[PDB]
Amino acid sequence: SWEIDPKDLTFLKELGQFGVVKYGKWRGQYDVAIKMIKMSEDEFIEEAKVMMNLSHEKLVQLYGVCTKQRPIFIITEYMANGCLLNYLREMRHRFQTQQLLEMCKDVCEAMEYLESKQFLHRDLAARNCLVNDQGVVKVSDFGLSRFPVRWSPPEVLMYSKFSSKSDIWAFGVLMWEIYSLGKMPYERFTNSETAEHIAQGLRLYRPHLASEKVYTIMYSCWHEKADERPTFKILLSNILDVMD
Ligand SMILES: Cc1nc(Nc2ncc(C(=O)Nc3c(C)cccc3Cl)s2)cc(N2CCN(CCO)CC2)n1
């Protein structure tokens, strides 16, 4: 039903953090990314099934799967501009602040949807987002859960207390990364000293390109008390409001 005939794929080039992925052509027309296993065959297939059951404008769009033979493939839309972190660096001289805001908005819409479906991302960060030829940012729904020190809240670092609210903290850091055009958070510190200082209440300082209004949004994501952080729904509203 989601099954694709592998005969209609043409492999064009190998493309890290997104696994074993190649650029291809589907039915001579459609640019695709084609994923193969690097995980057991069983869990790769169950990942594909998670993807079959999730759908949003800001999740990388599943086109189909090949599971009736080996090797197993997962097929999605090709995101031509690659990973967000490298894209921020590539285009750093060009961005206008409205664009930075739309990128935050894109990822925030994906996360509101995933929150609503009781999935946690668990590595929400610029390196793990993809960008299409239109500049639209999307998130992967492969490998979701139902600890990157610089993107984790204290309750995760200390207690492995993962929740919507821990993805909220990471989304704040991702906002900081976007507004800093891909700089490393807490550059001054080792991972260990980062974990240390954050529990002591260290927060990321306002990037050059973030207005006070925008900073207020990312900063709300980092409340010590998880229950004082906003939901992705509230975040999107705040982001939309600051947009006009
Ligand atoms: C690593 C990488 N991927 C790119 N595009 C992708 N589109 C969709 C991808 C993907 O992984 N789908 C997927 C699958 C298949 C299964 C489960 C889950 C998912 Cl999300 S990977 C582009 C790219 N480029 C290198 C540098 N460039 C400079 C141009 O500005 C050209 C672009 N590099």
18 is in an annotated binding site: yes
For ligand 1, the distance from its centroid to the CA atom of residue 130, given in whole angstroms, is: 7
Cα→Cα distances 33→13, 81, 87, 207, Å: 10, 12, 18, 34
15 is in an annotated binding site: yes
Q: Two tokens at 21?
A: 């992925």
Peptide bond into 71 cis (omega under 30): yes
Q: Compute the distance between CA of residue 105 and CA of residue 240 in angstroms, rounded to an integer.
A: 7
H/E element, 9:
strand 9-14
Q: What angle do CA 195, 197, 201 make, to 5 degrees?
A: 115
Chain breaks in the chain (C to N over 2.5 A) after: 15, 38, 146
Instruction: For domain 1-78, say whether CATH 3.30.200.20 is its number.
Output: yes
DSSP-based three-state secondary structure for 221: coil
Cα→Cα distances 124→9, 24, 111, Å: 31, 27, 9
Q: Compute the distance between CA of residue 90 and CA of residue 182 in angstroms, rounded to an integer.
A: 10
Q: Two tokens at 61?
A: 């769009």
Which residue, among 167, 152, 160, 59, has the nearest Cα to 115 in the 3D structure? 167
In this structure, are residues 213 and 71 in contact, taking their beta carbons and an 8 Å threshold?
no
For the chain, domain boundaries: 1-78, 79-244
Residues 6+ apart with CB under 8 A from 91: none
Give the residue whose CA is nearest to atom 25 of ligand 1: 82
Q: Is the dihedral of CA 18, 22, 23, 25 positive or negative?
A: negative
Protein residues whose CB sits closer than 6 Å to any atom of ligand 1: 15-16, 18, 21, 33-35, 60, 74, 76, 78-83, 130, 140, 142
Q: Compute the distance between CA of residue 232 and CA of residue 218 in angstroms, rounded to an integer.
A: 12
The catalytic position among 31, 106, 123, 133 is 123
Which residue, among 1, 122, 126, 124, has the nearest Cα to 68 in the 3D structure? 1
DSSP labels, 117-163: TT-B-S--SGGGEEE-TT--EEE--TT-B---GGG--HHHHHH---S
Packing angle between helix 164-179 and helix 232-243, nearest 10 degrees?
A: 30
Which residue, among 219, 47, 216, has the nearest Cα to 145 in the 3D structure? 47
Phi–psi pair at 154, nearest 5 degrees: -55, -35
Q: Compute the distance between CA of residue 155 and CA of residue 147 in angstroms, rounded to an integer.
A: 11
Which experiment gave this structure? X-ray
Q: Which of 67, 76, 129 to mutate to test the pocket of ligand 1 (most atoms within 8 A of CB)?
A: 76
Q: Compute the distance between CA of residue 215 and CA of residue 46 in angstroms, rounded to an integer.
A: 39
Q: Compute the distance between CA of residue 177 and CA of residue 181 in angstroms, rounded to an integer.
A: 6
CATH architecture of 79-244: Orthogonal Bundle (1.10)
Q: Compute the distance between CA of residue 236 and CA of residue 57 in angstroms, rounded to an integer.
A: 15
Resolution limit in angstroms?
Answer: 2.0
